[PDB]
């Protein structure tokens, strides 16, 4: 199974459910161990995540938290599966038992589907003034994102990209992106954040991804990729990192 996805998903979930009063028994998880696989076994985390991607999908009142017997748990699990299928996940290949047993590929497969949904949703249910608009509307989340990236990419005089894997491996594009995407101080009350462009000339691709990521952190966006995932052009993890900068 992908250790890189496991790790990425742990740090995302730890951040997402940091202050949830119902997950204190399991959050923060250790990204280097297989506790992501055991943590999922009671259904609570999954249900919670579903509502983060699509609000009001599961009633909190319907999730069982206290005194979890085996039956209560499978109820939690089946509820997670039925609701996820309902928001668009392809989960026909999994039942409560597989989750209860923490099967890697299955757990990582379901988690991604829920995460992607919430990542892409914001790009969808958010724009209008932010943009024939009707035609741009008929544009998929991923293409709309490349359109959005390339926009900032040219406003900074850097060349455009055609993808988020092979094209982003050296961090030079991500650097100008962060640079253009950073707060400028003009709003209700969000202060400017200027990012350090040194690191851009790091020479070692891996040392530049670290520097780039160090800057993404200032924005609160150091998620989904590690220097290694940036340099290997991981498509899934690099797509999620970019969608999050939009989001």
XYZ file of C-alpha atoms in Angstrom:
247
model
C 0.000 0.000 0.000
C 1.295 3.554 -0.365
C 3.191 4.667 2.679
C 3.232 8.170 1.185
C -0.530 8.325 1.002
C -0.922 6.880 4.462
C 1.444 9.592 5.865
C -0.211 12.435 3.871
C -3.678 11.388 4.958
C -2.653 11.176 8.637
C -1.396 14.744 8.797
C -4.416 16.031 6.937
C -6.889 14.290 9.238
C -4.952 15.303 12.363
C -5.315 18.899 11.201
C -8.936 18.552 10.119
C -10.191 16.914 13.333
C -7.676 18.583 15.716
C -10.361 20.135 17.947
C -13.129 17.580 17.539
C -14.312 16.493 21.020
C -15.394 13.067 19.746
C -12.078 11.990 18.297
C -9.751 12.888 21.206
C -9.228 9.197 21.845
C -7.541 8.693 18.464
C -6.407 12.133 17.181
C -3.411 12.975 16.770
C -2.396 9.789 14.981
C 1.226 8.849 14.328
C 1.840 9.173 10.545
C 4.772 6.766 10.651
C 2.893 3.874 12.161
C -0.123 1.874 11.098
C -2.414 3.514 13.565
C -4.301 5.190 10.707
C -5.544 1.668 10.018
C -6.633 0.961 13.600
C -7.974 4.493 14.206
C -10.648 4.017 11.546
C -12.125 0.850 13.027
C -14.918 2.505 15.063
C -16.535 4.574 12.322
C -16.444 7.927 14.108
C -13.483 9.393 12.148
C -14.996 8.341 8.780
C -18.419 9.820 9.522
C -16.744 13.031 10.766
C -14.687 13.265 7.581
C -17.776 12.760 5.376
C -19.441 15.859 6.840
C -16.213 17.831 6.326
C -16.314 17.105 2.612
C -20.120 17.442 2.318
C -21.721 19.242 5.271
C -24.904 17.813 6.791
C -24.483 14.429 5.210
C -24.585 12.530 8.538
C -26.457 13.812 11.578
C -24.042 14.010 14.526
C -26.927 12.594 16.530
C -26.655 9.444 14.393
C -22.986 8.753 15.099
C -22.356 6.606 18.161
C -19.537 7.811 20.397
C -20.032 6.376 23.892
C -20.035 2.738 25.010
C -19.130 1.187 21.654
C -20.011 -2.515 21.511
C -19.409 -4.560 18.330
C -22.970 -3.895 17.087
C -22.839 -0.153 17.735
C -19.571 -0.074 15.804
C -20.868 -1.895 12.685
C -23.813 0.514 12.735
C -21.296 3.377 12.702
C -19.389 1.643 9.879
C -22.328 0.815 7.707
C -23.539 4.394 8.153
C -20.204 5.674 6.922
C -20.304 3.372 3.896
C -23.928 4.155 2.944
C -23.428 7.928 3.267
C -20.054 7.887 1.282
C -21.643 5.907 -1.519
C -24.394 8.521 -1.451
C -21.997 11.456 -1.919
C -20.257 9.761 -4.793
C -17.738 7.232 -3.580
C -17.283 3.905 -5.407
C -17.475 1.675 -2.310
C -19.293 -1.417 -3.673
C -16.093 -3.390 -3.128
C -16.022 -2.903 0.659
C -18.090 -3.765 3.733
C -17.893 -2.866 7.427
C -15.756 -5.959 8.094
C -12.918 -4.794 5.833
C -12.837 -1.461 7.613
C -13.126 -3.123 10.999
C -10.047 -5.174 10.005
C -8.216 -2.037 8.783
C -7.384 -3.347 5.258
C -4.783 -0.832 3.876
C -5.651 -0.409 0.198
C -9.353 -0.254 1.115
C -8.990 2.312 3.868
C -6.598 4.526 1.804
C -8.872 4.127 -1.208
C -11.981 5.259 0.663
C -10.241 8.082 2.447
C -8.954 9.569 -0.802
C -12.381 9.518 -2.362
C -13.806 11.506 0.525
C -10.906 13.932 0.583
C -10.916 14.579 -3.152
C -14.682 15.249 -2.980
C -14.172 17.980 -0.393
C -11.109 19.370 -2.178
C -12.879 19.664 -5.572
C -16.160 20.812 -4.067
C -14.708 24.213 -3.036
C -13.387 24.765 -6.564
C -16.933 24.051 -7.773
C -19.265 25.623 -5.240
C -17.120 28.781 -5.219
C -16.249 31.253 -7.998
C -18.764 33.339 -10.021
C -17.145 36.736 -9.496
C -14.009 34.635 -9.174
C -13.493 33.840 -12.861
C -18.113 32.985 -21.366
C -18.366 32.149 -17.641
C -20.988 29.532 -18.565
C -18.288 27.773 -20.597
C -15.665 28.080 -17.825
C -18.364 26.535 -15.681
C -18.431 23.467 -17.987
C -14.750 23.011 -17.110
C -13.717 20.140 -14.799
C -12.116 20.896 -11.342
C -8.720 19.666 -12.547
C -8.693 21.664 -15.779
C -10.057 24.713 -13.995
C -7.119 24.371 -11.582
C -4.526 24.271 -14.336
C -6.209 27.335 -15.774
C -5.986 29.005 -12.353
C -2.323 28.019 -11.843
C -1.165 29.034 -15.299
C -2.912 32.396 -14.802
C -0.714 33.263 -11.820
C 2.207 31.536 -13.511
C 2.232 34.043 -16.377
C 1.501 37.037 -14.152
C 4.878 36.242 -12.597
C 6.645 35.742 -15.899
C 7.240 32.072 -15.380
C 6.385 29.497 -18.007
C 3.066 27.662 -17.848
C 2.528 24.029 -16.896
C 0.404 21.316 -18.416
C 0.267 19.046 -15.423
C 0.860 18.607 -11.680
C 3.402 15.831 -11.709
C 6.191 16.002 -14.272
C 5.932 19.739 -14.638
C 6.209 20.588 -10.936
C 9.070 18.328 -9.860
C 11.658 21.053 -9.426
C 9.468 23.432 -7.354
C 10.095 26.499 -9.510
C 6.456 26.673 -10.577
C 5.112 26.075 -7.056
C 7.375 28.890 -5.771
C 5.929 31.580 -8.097
C 2.491 30.182 -7.376
C 2.819 30.639 -3.603
C 4.335 33.994 -4.291
C 1.319 35.168 -6.267
C -1.215 33.427 -4.019
C -0.045 34.898 -0.704
C -2.218 37.413 1.217
C -1.633 41.013 0.168
C -3.290 42.611 3.194
C -6.343 43.885 1.324
C -9.501 42.403 2.894
C -11.701 42.303 6.021
C -8.653 41.758 8.212
C -6.109 39.278 6.779
C -2.561 40.663 6.992
C -0.064 40.415 4.211
C 2.320 37.451 4.090
C 5.362 37.785 1.918
C 7.180 34.543 1.093
C 10.940 34.092 0.918
C 11.998 33.458 -2.655
C 15.475 32.308 -1.705
C 15.505 28.530 -1.803
C 14.402 28.978 -5.408
C 18.104 28.917 -6.302
C 18.876 25.840 -4.134
C 20.413 23.650 -6.829
C 19.416 20.336 -5.155
C 15.852 19.597 -6.235
C 15.076 17.991 -2.893
C 16.462 20.922 -0.930
C 14.347 23.293 -3.034
C 11.141 21.331 -2.387
C 11.899 21.652 1.337
C 12.462 25.374 1.028
C 9.322 25.698 -1.090
C 7.382 23.711 1.468
C 8.784 25.777 4.298
C 7.118 28.782 2.653
C 3.820 26.951 1.980
C 3.719 26.468 5.766
C 3.546 30.224 6.347
C 0.276 30.149 4.480
C -0.896 27.142 6.460
C -0.636 25.076 3.296
C 2.063 22.515 3.994
C -0.123 19.507 3.295
C -0.293 16.452 1.074
C 3.311 16.438 -0.243
C 6.770 16.004 1.296
C 9.969 17.028 -0.536
C 10.180 13.438 -1.848
C 6.576 13.474 -3.206
C 7.263 16.723 -4.959
C 10.393 15.428 -6.669
C 8.791 12.131 -7.732
C 5.853 13.949 -9.321
C 3.316 11.918 -7.348
C 0.149 12.801 -9.278
C -2.412 12.176 -6.535
C -0.534 13.900 -3.732
C 0.603 16.833 -5.887
C -3.005 17.360 -7.182
C -4.276 17.531 -3.589
C -1.546 20.004 -2.571
C -2.562 22.371 -5.429
C -6.325 22.005 -4.833
C -5.657 22.935 -1.209
C -3.888 26.183 -2.261
C -7.013 27.002 -4.231
C -9.217 25.975 -1.249
